[PDB]
């Protein structure tokens, strides 16, 4: 629908003869303040400031309200006397807005106790366009990003493919849209993806990408990379050295009574403003302090600085919106995040990043808070660790398959920390230790013209459904044709087939009628464990030109014998550092739950994915070429 909502303004000018009686006044000269309330609109309770011992107060304060016309909107007015114990209500006055007409700017007089007089000004304009953007199309800033990055791709794609295989581009109308995908998976996903980005960076591959999407763990690296002050001038090369030094010290050791106390103190500001706080806020802060302690106040919006002239691929992040009823998560809605916006592309509903968290009503923001810090989003994107934080202090994948929707929404020496944190939280009343650990936010869908009936909503780690952020780039309007995915999902063993998540994404796609190349149910049987697989579309053309997927998987294969793509390991020492398993080892630093990565562990997983990416450039160069020739039809 449209909206047809009203903006009912109210000015509390002043009052005369504020009294409690001759006796009452002798005991306490009135300290007046007015309070307004409208039961038919989200959090309408508002109050003027009080005036110490004033019987003839002049407030002159303006209050705005967004009203639904199909409602009996009654403005309750209350004259109060601020006290040390319990403010006393001197008089209640009612006022129906209906008795007024749009544009009418009257001025009603109110009398309490037949003595005191108070003057209020009423207004009733027409609420303009919503703050919510209702469209399936990309937003102007994304469209401009594409158009401005287009020629950068073409140029870069030529330098990579060479003049020989880059023929089709010199006359190419539109170059191919390449999307890089990082999977979730804690610090394993984070350190892994960092090696991947170093490779994609130095090899010129990044320069051909239009998007970089991530979820859970990959997201933490993207946040760290894109928020770095020297990025893109400086690249993964230097930034990863920092990542290494930052992750070498156990993050859990950071959680100290003193530091936790700071976290709670800082968060109280957000709480105080009227936003809900949860364990995810705390987790978010911890992740923030370990990864971006020198830039804790970076927001999602501040990333616009690395994409203003399309000098980087557009960063995309995701989480899920879990309705209270929905029992199966494969049915939850995905929420996309980019420096330009946040929203649910299924229902064409978006908003600027700085509004995610604010209070809405009928598509109009009623109360706007300061934009959430990026570490909060980081927390939300990887909230699986906040739900199972006890554990972080039996694989996480195992603990996950059990968890129920109910369990996440509405409902050892390191264990002392968990108690200490919970103790500090209840002691300060930050939030009820029994409520949801998942992440909460005001419902921006609240009371929409035509889930719009529930004050807050649950947002959680997308990894709860599947580990690959496909919904982010399968969005029709993005027209991605080449998807270069990187999977760091945990497997029962290094020999275990790596298509669990992929098949799940494939099922999601079909479920939502979105183009997805057919993943042959015997790819592994016939292929065996490989560093990456390719999944071309299909001969037929039902709704053809569906993307081609290059699926990289976390596996230590050729890296065991080679230091670089065509360079073999020669010294006994070289063979040693590469001699390791990811999931096969019992004492492996690469389990999802682990956060302390000593330098050797970091280098291994980092260099591994670095090598694997580089050891397969040719496969990508090929898929692009094939993508170009497909863009010739
Ligand atoms: Ca007084
Ligand atoms: Ca008083």
Q: CATH code at 74?
A: 2.60.40.150
β-pair type (364-367, 456-460): unpaired
Which of 108, 126, 144 is at the close of a domain?
A: 126
Instruction: Return the SS3 of 365.
Output: strand
Q: Please count the structural domains in the chain.
A: 2
Ion ligand 2, residue ranges at CB < 5 A: 28, 31, 81, 83
Measure CA 249 to chain center: 26
Measure CA 220 to chain center: 11
Which residue among 44, 156, 216, 591 is the active-site one?
Answer: 216
> Burial letters for 147-168: b for 16+ Cβ neighbours within 10 Å, e otherwise?
eebeebbbebbbebbeeeebeb
Which two tokens mark 489? 């999902």
Query: What is the C-alpha to C-alpha distance for residues 217 and 597, in angstroms, rounded to an integer?
Result: 14
Domain that holds residue 116: 1-126
68 and 147 together in one domain = no
Which two tokens mark 117? 């007089």
CA of 123 to the centre of ligand 2 (A): 31
Give the angle 104-38-36 at the CA atoms, nearest 5°: 85
Task: Report which secondary-structure segment, H or E, holds 116.
Answer: strand 116-122
Query: What is the C-alpha to C-alpha distance for residues 184 and 463, in angstroms, rounded to an integer?
Result: 6
Binding residues: 28-29, 31, 53, 81-83
Query: What is the C-alpha to C-alpha distance for residues 254 and 245, in angstroms, rounded to an integer?
Result: 15
Give the angle 611-613-618 at the CA atoms, nearest 5°: 115
557 and 439 together in one domain = yes
CA of 12 to the centre of ligand 1 (A): 20
> What was the structure determination method?
X-ray
Instruction: Return the SS3 of 485.
Output: strand
Ligand with smallest separation from the Cα of 84: 2
CATH number of the structural domain spanning residue 397: 3.40.1090.10
CA of 82 to the centre of ligand 1 (A): 8
In the DSSP assignment, the letter for residue 370 is P
Ligand with smallest separation from the Cα of 27: 1
Burial class for 121, CB neighbours closer than 10 Å (0-12, 13-18, 19+): middle
Query: What is the C-alpha to C-alpha distance for residues 183 and 285, in angstroms, rounded to an integer?
Result: 22
Q: Which residue, 483, 474, 533, is CA-closest to 507?
A: 474
96 and 149 together in one domain = no
Which of 102, 126, 150 is at the close of a domain?
A: 126
Query: What is the C-alpha to C-alpha distance for residues 580 and 306, in angstroms, rounded to an integer?
Result: 37
Which of 73, 99, 126 is at the close of a domain?
A: 126
Whether 614 contacts 203, CB under 8 Å: yes
Whether 247 contacts 293, CB under 8 Å: no
353 and 417 together in one domain = yes
Calculate the CA dihedral of residues 219, 221, 223, 227 and round it to 10 degrees.
-160
Whether 41 contacts 361, CB under 8 Å: yes
DSSP E strand boundaries for 384-439:
none
Query: What is the C-alpha to C-alpha distance for residues 409 and 441, in angstroms, rounded to an integer?
Result: 12
Beta pairing partners, 54:
none
Which residue among 461, 481, 487, 494 is the active-site one?
Answer: 461
Calculate the CA dihedral of residues 567, 570, 573, 574 and round it to 10 degrees.
10
Q: Which residue, 629, 534, 590, 563, is CA-closest to 176?
A: 629
Which two tokens mark 427? 């002691």
Measure CA 370 to chain center: 16
For the chain, give the number of residues.
633
99 and 167 together in one domain = no
- Can you give the three-state secondary structure of 120-172, one letter per residue? EEECCEECCCCCCEECCCCCHHHHHHHHHHHHHHHHHHHHHHHHHHCHHHCCC
88 and 230 together in one domain = no
What are the backbone dihedrals phi and psi of residue 14, each rounded to the nearest 5 degrees, phi first? -160, 180
259 and 393 together in one domain = yes
First-to-last C-alpha distance (Å) of the chain: 39
330 and 423 together in one domain = yes
In the DSSP assignment, the letter for residue 277 is -
What are the backbone dihedrals phi and psi of residue 244, each rounded to the nearest 5 degrees, phi first? -60, -55
Binding residues for Ca(2+): 28-29, 31, 53, 81-83
Q: How many CA atoms lie within 13 A of 399 on its CB side?
A: 17
Q: How many CA atoms lie within 13 A of 486 on its CB side?
A: 32
83 and 43 together in one domain = yes
Question: For tokens 């501040």, what's the residue?
Answer: 302
Query: What is the C-alpha to C-alpha distance for residues 525 and 523, in angstroms, rounded to an integer?
Result: 6
Phi/psi region, residue 461 (left: phi>0; alpha: psi -120 to 50; beta: rest), is beta
In angstroms, what is the C-alpha Rg of the chain?
A: 29
Residue 495 annotated to the active site: no
β-pair type (548-553, 482-487): parallel
151 and 263 together in one domain = yes
Residue 135 annotated to the active site: no
Which two tokens mark 176? 């191919």
CA of 79 to the centre of ligand 2 (A): 12
Ligand with smallest separation from the Cα of 89: 2
Measure CA 378 to chain center: 7
Ligand with smallest separation from the Cα of 88: 2
Ligand with smallest separation from the Cα of 26: 1
CA of 507 to the centre of ligand 1 (A): 69
DSSP string, 200-269: HHHTS-GGGEEEEEE-THHHHHHHHHHT-TTTTTS-HHHHHHHHHHHHHS-GGGG--HHHHHHHHHHHHH
CA of 496 to the centre of ligand 1 (A): 76
Measure CA 52 to chain center: 45
CA of 17 to the centre of ligand 2 (A): 15
CA of 119 to the centre of ligand 2 (A): 21
101 and 239 together in one domain = no
Ligand with smallest separation from the Cα of 82: 2
CA of 28 to the centre of ligand 1 (A): 4
CA of 41 to the centre of ligand 2 (A): 30
Query: What is the C-alpha to C-alpha distance for residues 188 and 573, in angstroms, rounded to an integer?
Result: 24
Which two tokens mark 208? 């051909």
Measure CA 426 to chain center: 27
CA of 18 to the centre of ligand 2 (A): 11
What are the backbone dihedrals phi and psi of residue 169, each rounded to the nearest 5 degrees, phi first? -85, -35
CA of 431 to the centre of ligand 2 (A): 32
Instruction: Return the SS3 of 575.
Output: helix
Whether 214 contacts 193, CB under 8 Å: yes
CA of 31 to the centre of ligand 2 (A): 5
Whether 123 contacts 109, CB under 8 Å: no
Question: For tokens 């364990």, what's the residue?
Answer: 279
Query: What is the C-alpha to C-alpha distance for residues 448 and 557, in angstroms, rounded to an integer?
Result: 54
Which two tokens mark 529? 């464990």
Going across the sheet that includes 76-81, the strands are: 46-47, 32-37, 76-81, 88-93
Whether 299 contacts 318, CB under 8 Å: no
Beta pairing partners, 79:
34, 91
CA distances (Å), origin 23, targets 257, 393, 452: 52, 63, 51
Ligand with smallest separation from the Cα of 53: 1
Question: For tokens 């298509």, what's the residue?
Answer: 499
Which two tokens mark 468? 């690959």
Query: What is the C-alpha to C-alpha distance for residues 541 and 285, in angstroms, rounded to an integer?
Result: 48
148 and 119 together in one domain = no
CA of 86 to the centre of ligand 1 (A): 13
């Amino acid at each position: 629908e449209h909206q047809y909502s009203h903006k009912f303004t109210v000015v509390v000018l002043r009052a005369t003869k504020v009294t409690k009686g001759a006796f009452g006044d002798m005991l306490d000269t009135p300290d007046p303040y007015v309070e307004l309330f409208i039961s038919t609109t989200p959090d309408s309770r508002k109050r003027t400031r009080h005036f110490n011992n004033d019987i003839n107060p002049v407030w002159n304060e303006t209050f705005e309200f967004i009203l639904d016309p199909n409602q009996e909107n009654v403005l309750e007015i209350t004259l109060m006397d601020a006290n040390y114990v319990m403010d006393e209500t001197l008089g209640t006055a009612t006022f129906t807005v209906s008795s007024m007409k749009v544009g009418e700017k009257k001025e009603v007089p109110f009398i309490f106790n037949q003595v005191t007089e108070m003057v209020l000004e009423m207004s009733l304009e027409v609420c303009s366009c919503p703050d919510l953007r209702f469209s399936m199309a990309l937003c102007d800033q994304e469209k401009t990003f594409r158009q401005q990055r287009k020629e950068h791709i073409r140029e870069s794609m030529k330098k990579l493919l060479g003049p020989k295989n880059s023929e089709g581009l010199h006359s190419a109308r539109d170059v191919p849209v390449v999307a890089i995908l990082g999977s979730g998976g804690g610090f394993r996903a984070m350190v892994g993806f960092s090696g991947v980005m170093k490779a994609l960076y130095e090899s010129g591959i990044l320069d051909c990408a239009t998007y970089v999407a991530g979820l859970s763990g990959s997201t933490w690296y993207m946040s760290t990379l894109y928020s770095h002050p020297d990025f893109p001038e400086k690249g993964p090369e230097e930034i990863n050295e920092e990542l290494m030094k930052n992750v070498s010290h156990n993050p859990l050791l950071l959680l100290t009574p003193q530091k936790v106390k700071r976290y709670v103190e800082s968060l109280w500001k957000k709480k105080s403003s009227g936003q809900p706080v949860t364990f995810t806020d705390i987790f978010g802060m911890l992740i923030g302090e370990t990864l971006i302690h020198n830039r804790m106040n970076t927001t999602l919006s501040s990333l616009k600085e690395k994409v203003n002239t399309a000098q980087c691929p557009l960063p995309l992040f995701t989480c899920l919106h879990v309705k209270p009823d929905v029992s199966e998560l494969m049915f939850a809605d995905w929420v996309e995040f980019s420096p330009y916006e946040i929203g649910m592309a299924k229902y064409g509903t978006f908003m600027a990043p700085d509004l995610f968290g604010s209070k809405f009503f009928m598509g109009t923001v009623v109360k706007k808070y300061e934009e959430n810090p990026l570490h909060f989003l980081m927390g939300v994107w990887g909230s699986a660790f906040s739900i199972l934080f006890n554990r972080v202090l039996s694989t996480m994948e195992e603990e996950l398959e059990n968890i129920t929707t109910k369990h996440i929404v509405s409902n050892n020496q390191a264990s002392w920390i968990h108690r200490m944190i919970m103790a500090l939280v209840s002691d300060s009343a930050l939030f009820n230790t029994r409520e949801g650990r998942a992440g909460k936010v005001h419902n921006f869908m609240l009371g929409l013209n035509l889930d719009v009936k529930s004050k807050k909503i649950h947002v959680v780690d997308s990894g709860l459904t599947f580990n690959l952020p496909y919904p982010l780039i399968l969005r029709p309007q993005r027209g991605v044709d080449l998807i270069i995915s990187f999977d760091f999902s945990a497997r029962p063993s290094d020999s275990s087939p790596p298509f669990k998540e992929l098949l799940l994404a494939e099922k999601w796609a079909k479920m939502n009628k979105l183009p997805f190349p057919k993943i042959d149910p015997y790819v592994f049987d016939r292929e065996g464990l490989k560093e990456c697989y390719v999944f071309k579309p299909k001969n037929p053309d039902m709704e053809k030109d569906c993307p081609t997927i290059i699926h990289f998987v976390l596996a230590n294969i050729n890296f065991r014998k080679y230091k670089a793509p065509g360079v073999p390991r020669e010294t006994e020492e070289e063979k040693e550092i590469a001699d390791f398993d990811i999931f096969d080892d019992p004492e492996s630093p690469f389990s999802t739950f682990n956060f302390q990565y000593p330098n050797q562990a970091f280098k291994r997983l980092h260099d591994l994915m670095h090598f694997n990416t580089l050891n397969n450039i040719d496969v990508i160069k090929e898929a692009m070429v094939e993508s170009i020739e497909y863009r010739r039809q």
